[PDB]
Amino acid sequence: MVLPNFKENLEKYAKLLVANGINVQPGHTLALSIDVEQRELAHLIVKEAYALGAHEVIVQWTDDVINREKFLHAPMERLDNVPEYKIAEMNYLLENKASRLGVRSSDPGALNGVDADKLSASAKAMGLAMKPMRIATQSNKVSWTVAAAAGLEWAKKVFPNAASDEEAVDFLWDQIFKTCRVYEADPVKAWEEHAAILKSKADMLNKEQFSALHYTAPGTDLTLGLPKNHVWESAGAVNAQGEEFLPNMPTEEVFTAPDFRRADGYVTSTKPLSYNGNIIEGIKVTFKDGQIVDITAEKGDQVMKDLVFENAGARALGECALVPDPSPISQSGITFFNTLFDDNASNHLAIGAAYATSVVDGAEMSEEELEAAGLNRSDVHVDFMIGSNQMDIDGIREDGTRVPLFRNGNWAN
Amino acid sequence: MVLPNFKENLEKYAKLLVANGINVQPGHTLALSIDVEQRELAHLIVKEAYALGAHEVIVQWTDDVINREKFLHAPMERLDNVPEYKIAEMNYLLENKASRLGVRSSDPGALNGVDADKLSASAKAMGLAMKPMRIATQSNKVSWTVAAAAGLEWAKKVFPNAASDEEAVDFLWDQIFKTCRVYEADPVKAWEEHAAILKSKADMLNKEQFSALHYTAPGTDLTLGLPKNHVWESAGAVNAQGEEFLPNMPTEEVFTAPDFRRADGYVTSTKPLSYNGNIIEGIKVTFKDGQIVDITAEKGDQVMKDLVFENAGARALGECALVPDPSPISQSGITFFNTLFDDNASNHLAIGAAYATSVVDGAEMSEEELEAAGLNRSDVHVDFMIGSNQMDIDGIREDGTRVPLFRNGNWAN
Ligand SMILES: N[C@@H](Cc1c[nH]c2ccccc12)C(=O)NCC(=O)O
Ligand SMILES: N[C@@H](Cc1c[nH]c2ccccc12)C(=O)NCC(=O)O
Ligand SMILES: [Zn+2]
Ligand SMILES: [Zn+2]
Ligand SMILES: [Zn+2]
Ligand SMILES: [Zn+2]
């Protein structure tokens, strides 16, 4: 009722994720991560990947309830290390240059019961064990895409105003379809148009080559240095095999990496965050000489400290992204409690790893060369949102000139 | 109206599978193999496993649609061998003495229209790669349970006259709950009494120690030798750690292994069979000197010929089981096209591997000893059914005396 032609649009969505998000090509292997709740979408995705000439789809099924039981009941020794067979599966994917399509529909509070130390122990061990995959994906060795599906518990959280559980799921699918341009008579041209607009903006910032950025808002006075030869990117990426792909669907951001050594001041989150299956609220981060010197949260304080202080590289930033407050997802007024969606409603910063393509020729650099160039090396990448209808940002030029970039949450001069 | 209190009964079923089927103990690792469509049951199973003290439940999610897509579209090279990481997951389970709970819900014709040579190559490669698990399980080194859940495509085939999909599914769950004693006030006691009654038939046969069995029915005249010192088993088993478990739920059979070197005559199958995701109908087999000399089917003839002639040990039998025609699954009038259920409606025979436990002290014999003892070795174990209300069976004593065993498909007396 609130959603037109669900089955047809679900198929159209699945084909878009495969053809334009991951861009499957004859001979590819595709790894799909998707919740068991979303078997209907998984079937559609798998069929199209094979129709586009994939040699193999490997589905990594995920399930919130079973994962919570494990975190609630398994002893630490089953939680604080990653079994070799999981690493072996990882290596099979990498040896086959598998594209990674991650469809997220998870409950934002999936792990609300769980002891903080177990959450921390499991995230650190995963960050360590999965490093080769993170490195490959972050330097675009293979295609990869993060997209969403309308999970029940998630939809319930997003739409308290819904008349039923079924209706809440439908409004969530309507957002996912709307923002991924599924309703457009030609979604592919619609994405081309969207990529082209965002690319105009990124190209302009790339001409500027600011020295640093200065963000001001009620929770926030933060200055970030920008690496020499940095690259602002947006909607499309290109993999090491020359193929175009979309890392995030939906997406509304242009972003680059700050120099992980230059950050000073303080910043306040402006959206709740789902991290380690807990909802984190009111994050305040303080930086001195590039490093987080203090992080607190009104809710989820320990979980955030554990992220920052237990994981390699997690005391510095790997991304600074700009999304105008008047853009569609933001203007919807909807809080998604979901990084993919909320990132695309608000300026965001990532704790941890820079994308290698954030510096000219980064895709070719050793890890040593990336760190030399100012791109944080880390075993995590955790975005949090700082944007609002009040935020100002200036770019600082090499002659000391402050150039307005955002005024009252929007591009301005 | 067909199936009241479904949620209550589903949870009661989950509890039974975990507490009495697998018999989860503190410290155990449980491996649950289950279709994604059965996520509701999976949750309940996993919850109860941890409630009973499991340290870890690993779920191996299956999906017919996605498996069929791979078989239809992947090249032979991805089908005819097993990647290392799958072997590594199997080894993690072995190392952890994982109990194996397999809940089957597959569409009997899930793989219709797949190239026969692909089905054959995959089954062979998997049979070889997974042998350590099958060996451990065929010798009760861990608890294991095969049980069912009412998958939609399977229910539609079992109940082609159902008023609606929902009704077909309810009818199938009703059979699963009834036959697994879920409706009893005290299912455990009901199981205990059921096992008692079958164990008394098994003990009678173990006492007689027949040299051979002679089956007669329209289209059947078959004499099978029995191994010296064989063991007839039923309902309960005891695993290598002294824990009681139920290898099949439901179950109505008493069975042992024939001497694989002794078989003469011919036999007509009286139920269809689902093998490699294809429905096989009208199976007839002729044996001479212990070996299949001809096998034939009205539908699926090639799949059977490939089974028998492409796999080592597959020309000989590993199981001979008795189920009286008046027992409840037989009397229901339903053909399930599913091995667990149809096995428990009808006498059956297994092409391929004998269970090690079918000879005295077999669970500690090597492969060489088992084979010397007359128990067939094979990477396959495919049951087909041969019983009916017209079948007579004699037991044949060592001195040639013919003892009536079944008459008209029921115990003779
Ligand atoms: N800024 C996003 C994702 C991201 C990385 N490379 C990109 C190229 C083009 C668009 C978006 C890209 C981020 O780091 N997080 C979003 C996510 O959840 O992956
Ligand atoms: N006859 C069953 C397996 C089996 C092994 N030990 C048992 C004890 C009690 C009942 C059944 C037992 C068979 O080979 N096939 C059933 C199956 O699908 O596993
Ligand atoms: Zn971003
Ligand atoms: Zn990010
Ligand atoms: Zn049997
Ligand atoms: Zn059998």
PDB file of N, CA and C in Angstrom, chain A residues 27 29 36-37 39 42-43 46-47 50 54-59 61-63 65-66 69-70 73-75 78 83-85 88-89 92 96, chain B residues 27 29 36-37 39 42-43 46-47 50 54-59 61-63 65-66 69-70 73-75 78 83-85 88-89 92 96:
ATOM      1  N   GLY A  27      33.056 -14.669 -15.572  1.00  0.00           N
ATOM      2  CA  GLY A  27      34.188 -15.263 -14.872  1.00  0.00           C
ATOM      3  C   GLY A  27      34.409 -14.865 -13.436  1.00  0.00           C
ATOM      4  N   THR A  29      33.995 -14.278  -9.373  1.00  0.00           N
ATOM      5  CA  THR A  29      33.402 -14.832  -8.190  1.00  0.00           C
ATOM      6  C   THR A  29      32.779 -13.635  -7.432  1.00  0.00           C
ATOM      7  N   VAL A  36      19.742 -14.011   6.702  1.00  0.00           N
ATOM      8  CA  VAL A  36      18.816 -15.077   6.324  1.00  0.00           C
ATOM      9  C   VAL A  36      17.403 -14.553   6.204  1.00  0.00           C
ATOM     10  N   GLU A  37      17.082 -13.532   6.987  1.00  0.00           N
ATOM     11  CA  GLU A  37      15.767 -12.896   6.857  1.00  0.00           C
ATOM     12  C   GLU A  37      15.514 -12.382   5.426  1.00  0.00           C
ATOM     13  N   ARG A  39      16.256 -13.795   2.445  1.00  0.00           N
ATOM     14  CA  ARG A  39      16.431 -14.847   1.434  1.00  0.00           C
ATOM     15  C   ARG A  39      15.806 -14.489   0.123  1.00  0.00           C
ATOM     16  N   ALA A  42      18.231 -12.238  -1.595  1.00  0.00           N
ATOM     17  CA  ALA A  42      19.402 -13.043  -1.943  1.00  0.00           C
ATOM     18  C   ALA A  42      19.186 -13.889  -3.205  1.00  0.00           C
ATOM     19  N   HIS A  43      18.054 -14.593  -3.286  1.00  0.00           N
ATOM     20  CA  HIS A  43      17.702 -15.345  -4.517  1.00  0.00           C
ATOM     21  C   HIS A  43      17.786 -14.506  -5.780  1.00  0.00           C
ATOM     22  N   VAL A  46      21.485 -13.525  -6.496  1.00  0.00           N
ATOM     23  CA  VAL A  46      22.261 -14.654  -6.988  1.00  0.00           C
ATOM     24  C   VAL A  46      21.930 -14.997  -8.444  1.00  0.00           C
ATOM     25  N   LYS A  47      20.647 -14.988  -8.778  1.00  0.00           N
ATOM     26  CA  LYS A  47      20.236 -15.258 -10.143  1.00  0.00           C
ATOM     27  C   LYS A  47      20.859 -14.270 -11.140  1.00  0.00           C
ATOM     28  N   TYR A  50      24.660 -14.801 -11.731  1.00  0.00           N
ATOM     29  CA  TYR A  50      24.902 -15.873 -12.690  1.00  0.00           C
ATOM     30  C   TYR A  50      24.496 -15.476 -14.091  1.00  0.00           C
ATOM     31  N   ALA A  54      28.796 -14.638 -13.839  1.00  0.00           N
ATOM     32  CA  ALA A  54      29.589 -15.094 -12.691  1.00  0.00           C
ATOM     33  C   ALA A  54      29.856 -16.574 -12.806  1.00  0.00           C
ATOM     34  N   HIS A  55      31.072 -17.002 -12.455  1.00  0.00           N
ATOM     35  CA  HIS A  55      31.410 -18.418 -12.315  1.00  0.00           C
ATOM     36  C   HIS A  55      31.010 -18.984 -10.964  1.00  0.00           C
ATOM     37  N   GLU A  56      30.944 -18.129  -9.935  1.00  0.00           N
ATOM     38  CA  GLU A  56      30.573 -18.639  -8.617  1.00  0.00           C
ATOM     39  C   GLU A  56      30.013 -17.522  -7.736  1.00  0.00           C
ATOM     40  N   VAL A  57      28.867 -17.754  -7.101  1.00  0.00           N
ATOM     41  CA  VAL A  57      28.413 -16.878  -5.997  1.00  0.00           C
ATOM     42  C   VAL A  57      28.548 -17.638  -4.680  1.00  0.00           C
ATOM     43  N   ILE A  58      29.286 -17.089  -3.735  1.00  0.00           N
ATOM     44  CA  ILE A  58      29.391 -17.653  -2.378  1.00  0.00           C
ATOM     45  C   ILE A  58      28.544 -16.744  -1.465  1.00  0.00           C
ATOM     46  N   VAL A  59      27.527 -17.322  -0.826  1.00  0.00           N
ATOM     47  CA  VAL A  59      26.666 -16.536   0.079  1.00  0.00           C
ATOM     48  C   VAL A  59      27.081 -16.741   1.518  1.00  0.00           C
ATOM     49  N   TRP A  61      25.722 -16.119   4.801  1.00  0.00           N
ATOM     50  CA  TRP A  61      24.510 -15.834   5.551  1.00  0.00           C
ATOM     51  C   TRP A  61      24.807 -15.391   6.968  1.00  0.00           C
ATOM     52  N   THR A  62      24.024 -14.459   7.442  1.00  0.00           N
ATOM     53  CA  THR A  62      24.266 -13.792   8.665  1.00  0.00           C
ATOM     54  C   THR A  62      22.899 -13.841   9.408  1.00  0.00           C
ATOM     55  N   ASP A  63      22.889 -13.784  10.740  1.00  0.00           N
ATOM     56  CA  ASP A  63      21.631 -13.813  11.489  1.00  0.00           C
ATOM     57  C   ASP A  63      21.866 -13.222  12.894  1.00  0.00           C
ATOM     58  N   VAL A  65      19.931 -12.988  15.556  1.00  0.00           N
ATOM     59  CA  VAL A  65      19.472 -13.645  16.756  1.00  0.00           C
ATOM     60  C   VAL A  65      20.469 -14.659  17.147  1.00  0.00           C
ATOM     61  N   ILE A  66      20.986 -15.392  16.163  1.00  0.00           N
ATOM     62  CA  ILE A  66      21.965 -16.424  16.495  1.00  0.00           C
ATOM     63  C   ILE A  66      23.298 -15.818  16.929  1.00  0.00           C
ATOM     64  N   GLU A  69      22.924 -14.804  20.620  1.00  0.00           N
ATOM     65  CA  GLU A  69      22.952 -15.962  21.516  1.00  0.00           C
ATOM     66  C   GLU A  69      24.395 -16.331  21.739  1.00  0.00           C
ATOM     67  N   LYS A  70      25.164 -16.277  20.667  1.00  0.00           N
ATOM     68  CA  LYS A  70      26.548 -16.663  20.789  1.00  0.00           C
ATOM     69  C   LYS A  70      27.269 -15.675  21.728  1.00  0.00           C
ATOM     70  N   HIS A  73      26.154 -16.251  25.352  1.00  0.00           N
ATOM     71  CA  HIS A  73      26.316 -17.536  26.016  1.00  0.00           C
ATOM     72  C   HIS A  73      27.657 -18.228  25.806  1.00  0.00           C
ATOM     73  N   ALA A  74      28.334 -17.935  24.702  1.00  0.00           N
ATOM     74  CA  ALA A  74      29.583 -18.617  24.438  1.00  0.00           C
ATOM     75  C   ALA A  74      30.681 -18.046  25.329  1.00  0.00           C
ATOM     76  N   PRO A  75      31.617 -18.898  25.751  1.00  0.00           N
ATOM     77  CA  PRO A  75      32.639 -18.295  26.606  1.00  0.00           C
ATOM     78  C   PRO A  75      33.608 -17.448  25.778  1.00  0.00           C
ATOM     79  N   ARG A  78      35.539 -18.573  22.818  1.00  0.00           N
ATOM     80  CA  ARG A  78      34.975 -18.804  21.473  1.00  0.00           C
ATOM     81  C   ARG A  78      34.793 -17.421  20.808  1.00  0.00           C
ATOM     82  N   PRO A  83      38.659 -18.587  14.075  1.00  0.00           N
ATOM     83  CA  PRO A  83      39.116 -19.926  13.664  1.00  0.00           C
ATOM     84  C   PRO A  83      39.745 -19.925  12.310  1.00  0.00           C
ATOM     85  N   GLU A  84      40.720 -20.804  12.089  1.00  0.00           N
ATOM     86  CA  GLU A  84      41.419 -20.789  10.817  1.00  0.00           C
ATOM     87  C   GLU A  84      40.441 -20.957   9.670  1.00  0.00           C
ATOM     88  N   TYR A  85      39.333 -21.694   9.837  1.00  0.00           N
ATOM     89  CA  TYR A  85      38.507 -21.988   8.633  1.00  0.00           C
ATOM     90  C   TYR A  85      37.887 -20.698   8.071  1.00  0.00           C
ATOM     91  N   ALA A  88      40.555 -19.172   6.139  1.00  0.00           N
ATOM     92  CA  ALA A  88      40.654 -19.883   4.868  1.00  0.00           C
ATOM     93  C   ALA A  88      39.565 -19.462   3.891  1.00  0.00           C
ATOM     94  N   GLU A  89      38.368 -19.225   4.398  1.00  0.00           N
ATOM     95  CA  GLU A  89      37.319 -18.814   3.475  1.00  0.00           C
ATOM     96  C   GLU A  89      37.690 -17.460   2.927  1.00  0.00           C
ATOM     97  N   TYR A  92      40.225 -17.847   0.170  1.00  0.00           N
ATOM     98  CA  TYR A  92      39.683 -18.373  -1.075  1.00  0.00           C
ATOM     99  C   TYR A  92      39.078 -17.187  -1.835  1.00  0.00           C
ATOM    100  N   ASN A  96      40.500 -15.706  -5.496  1.00  0.00           N
ATOM    101  CA  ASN A  96      39.610 -15.624  -6.642  1.00  0.00           C
ATOM    102  C   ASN A  96      39.160 -14.203  -6.959  1.00  0.00           C
TER     103      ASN A  96
ATOM    104  N   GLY B  27      29.493 -27.559  27.563  1.00  0.00           N
ATOM    105  CA  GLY B  27      30.802 -27.671  26.923  1.00  0.00           C
ATOM    106  C   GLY B  27      30.757 -28.094  25.461  1.00  0.00           C
ATOM    107  N   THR B  29      29.992 -28.410  21.351  1.00  0.00           N
ATOM    108  CA  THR B  29      29.833 -27.608  20.152  1.00  0.00           C
ATOM    109  C   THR B  29      28.736 -28.307  19.344  1.00  0.00           C
ATOM    110  N   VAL B  36      17.653 -21.773   5.219  1.00  0.00           N
ATOM    111  CA  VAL B  36      17.350 -20.400   5.601  1.00  0.00           C
ATOM    112  C   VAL B  36      15.886 -20.165   5.778  1.00  0.00           C
ATOM    113  N   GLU B  37      15.078 -20.895   5.024  1.00  0.00           N
ATOM    114  CA  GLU B  37      13.634 -20.707   5.118  1.00  0.00           C
ATOM    115  C   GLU B  37      13.136 -21.112   6.494  1.00  0.00           C
ATOM    116  N   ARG B  39      14.489 -20.295   9.372  1.00  0.00           N
ATOM    117  CA  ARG B  39      15.153 -19.497  10.380  1.00  0.00           C
ATOM    118  C   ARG B  39      14.415 -19.495  11.719  1.00  0.00           C
ATOM    119  N   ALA B  42      15.417 -22.512  13.488  1.00  0.00           N
ATOM    120  CA  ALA B  42      16.848 -22.419  13.776  1.00  0.00           C
ATOM    121  C   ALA B  42      17.060 -21.637  15.076  1.00  0.00           C
ATOM    122  N   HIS B  43      16.345 -20.518  15.212  1.00  0.00           N
ATOM    123  CA  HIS B  43      16.491 -19.632  16.404  1.00  0.00           C
ATOM    124  C   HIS B  43      16.192 -20.393  17.663  1.00  0.00           C
ATOM    125  N   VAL B  46      18.906 -23.023  18.397  1.00  0.00           N
ATOM    126  CA  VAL B  46      20.116 -22.409  18.896  1.00  0.00           C
ATOM    127  C   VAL B  46      19.896 -21.897  20.314  1.00  0.00           C
ATOM    128  N   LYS B  47      18.768 -21.241  20.565  1.00  0.00           N
ATOM    129  CA  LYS B  47      18.463 -20.830  21.953  1.00  0.00           C
ATOM    130  C   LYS B  47      18.519 -22.000  22.944  1.00  0.00           C
ATOM    131  N   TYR B  50      22.146 -23.429  23.672  1.00  0.00           N
ATOM    132  CA  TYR B  50      22.915 -22.637  24.656  1.00  0.00           C
ATOM    133  C   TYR B  50      22.296 -22.774  26.033  1.00  0.00           C
ATOM    134  N   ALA B  54      25.723 -25.614  25.767  1.00  0.00           N
ATOM    135  CA  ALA B  54      26.669 -25.593  24.617  1.00  0.00           C
ATOM    136  C   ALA B  54      27.609 -24.409  24.733  1.00  0.00           C
ATOM    137  N   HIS B  55      28.856 -24.595  24.339  1.00  0.00           N
ATOM    138  CA  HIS B  55      29.799 -23.485  24.261  1.00  0.00           C
ATOM    139  C   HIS B  55      29.727 -22.771  22.917  1.00  0.00           C
ATOM    140  N   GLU B  56      29.163 -23.434  21.902  1.00  0.00           N
ATOM    141  CA  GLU B  56      29.104 -22.866  20.563  1.00  0.00           C
ATOM    142  C   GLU B  56      28.170 -23.637  19.638  1.00  0.00           C
ATOM    143  N   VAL B  57      27.329 -22.901  18.919  1.00  0.00           N
ATOM    144  CA  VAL B  57      26.496 -23.503  17.898  1.00  0.00           C
ATOM    145  C   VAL B  57      27.018 -22.878  16.600  1.00  0.00           C
ATOM    146  N   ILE B  58      27.399 -23.697  15.643  1.00  0.00           N
ATOM    147  CA  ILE B  58      27.723 -23.203  14.329  1.00  0.00           C
ATOM    148  C   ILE B  58      26.579 -23.603  13.402  1.00  0.00           C
ATOM    149  N   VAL B  59      26.049 -22.642  12.657  1.00  0.00           N
ATOM    150  CA  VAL B  59      24.953 -22.942  11.790  1.00  0.00           C
ATOM    151  C   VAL B  59      25.477 -22.947  10.383  1.00  0.00           C
ATOM    152  N   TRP B  61      23.945 -22.796   7.002  1.00  0.00           N
ATOM    153  CA  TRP B  61      22.686 -22.470   6.359  1.00  0.00           C
ATOM    154  C   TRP B  61      22.675 -23.028   4.939  1.00  0.00           C
ATOM    155  N   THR B  62      21.587 -23.663   4.549  1.00  0.00           N
ATOM    156  CA  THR B  62      21.452 -24.170   3.173  1.00  0.00           C
ATOM    157  C   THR B  62      20.362 -23.429   2.448  1.00  0.00           C
ATOM    158  N   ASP B  63      20.373 -23.487   1.120  1.00  0.00           N
ATOM    159  CA  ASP B  63      19.341 -22.837   0.356  1.00  0.00           C
ATOM    160  C   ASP B  63      19.230 -23.504  -0.983  1.00  0.00           C
ATOM    161  N   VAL B  65      17.449 -22.725  -3.691  1.00  0.00           N
ATOM    162  CA  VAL B  65      17.402 -21.893  -4.879  1.00  0.00           C
ATOM    163  C   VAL B  65      18.799 -21.536  -5.317  1.00  0.00           C
ATOM    164  N   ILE B  66      19.614 -21.208  -4.330  1.00  0.00           N
ATOM    165  CA  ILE B  66      20.991 -20.771  -4.572  1.00  0.00           C
ATOM    166  C   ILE B  66      21.886 -21.952  -4.964  1.00  0.00           C
ATOM    167  N   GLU B  69      21.047 -22.606  -8.648  1.00  0.00           N
ATOM    168  CA  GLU B  69      21.675 -21.614  -9.503  1.00  0.00           C
ATOM    169  C   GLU B  69      23.133 -21.963  -9.762  1.00  0.00           C
ATOM    170  N   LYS B  70      23.847 -22.343  -8.711  1.00  0.00           N
ATOM    171  CA  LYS B  70      25.254 -22.764  -8.893  1.00  0.00           C
ATOM    172  C   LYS B  70      25.372 -23.977  -9.862  1.00  0.00           C
ATOM    173  N   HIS B  73      24.615 -22.967 -13.453  1.00  0.00           N
ATOM    174  CA  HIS B  73      25.426 -21.945 -14.088  1.00  0.00           C
ATOM    175  C   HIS B  73      26.927 -21.987 -13.856  1.00  0.00           C
ATOM    176  N   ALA B  74      27.404 -22.518 -12.736  1.00  0.00           N
ATOM    177  CA  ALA B  74      28.839 -22.531 -12.547  1.00  0.00           C
ATOM    178  C   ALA B  74      29.510 -23.568 -13.473  1.00  0.00           C
ATOM    179  N   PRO B  75      30.759 -23.303 -13.895  1.00  0.00           N
ATOM    180  CA  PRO B  75      31.467 -24.312 -14.714  1.00  0.00           C
ATOM    181  C   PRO B  75      31.804 -25.552 -13.905  1.00  0.00           C
ATOM    182  N   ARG B  78      34.123 -25.489 -10.755  1.00  0.00           N
ATOM    183  CA  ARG B  78      33.724 -25.025  -9.428  1.00  0.00           C
ATOM    184  C   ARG B  78      32.851 -26.071  -8.771  1.00  0.00           C
ATOM    185  N   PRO B  83      36.593 -26.814  -2.302  1.00  0.00           N
ATOM    186  CA  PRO B  83      37.613 -25.899  -1.831  1.00  0.00           C
ATOM    187  C   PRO B  83      38.097 -26.242  -0.419  1.00  0.00           C
ATOM    188  N   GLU B  84      39.375 -25.972  -0.195  1.00  0.00           N
ATOM    189  CA  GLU B  84      40.009 -26.166   1.097  1.00  0.00           C
ATOM    190  C   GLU B  84      39.254 -25.651   2.304  1.00  0.00           C
ATOM    191  N   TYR B  85      38.734 -24.435   2.226  1.00  0.00           N
ATOM    192  CA  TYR B  85      38.105 -23.862   3.409  1.00  0.00           C
ATOM    193  C   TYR B  85      36.925 -24.672   3.906  1.00  0.00           C
ATOM    194  N   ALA B  88      38.443 -27.287   5.893  1.00  0.00           N
ATOM    195  CA  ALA B  88      38.865 -26.680   7.160  1.00  0.00           C
ATOM    196  C   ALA B  88      37.706 -26.516   8.146  1.00  0.00           C
ATOM    197  N   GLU B  89      36.532 -26.097   7.654  1.00  0.00           N
ATOM    198  CA  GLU B  89      35.362 -26.004   8.560  1.00  0.00           C
ATOM    199  C   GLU B  89      35.005 -27.402   9.063  1.00  0.00           C
ATOM    200  N   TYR B  92      37.423 -28.249  11.875  1.00  0.00           N
ATOM    201  CA  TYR B  92      37.118 -27.517  13.126  1.00  0.00           C
ATOM    202  C   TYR B  92      36.030 -28.209  13.916  1.00  0.00           C
ATOM    203  N   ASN B  96      36.453 -30.347  17.535  1.00  0.00           N
ATOM    204  CA  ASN B  96      35.663 -29.926  18.660  1.00  0.00           C
ATOM    205  C   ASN B  96      34.599 -30.964  19.070  1.00  0.00           C
TER     206      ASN B  96
END
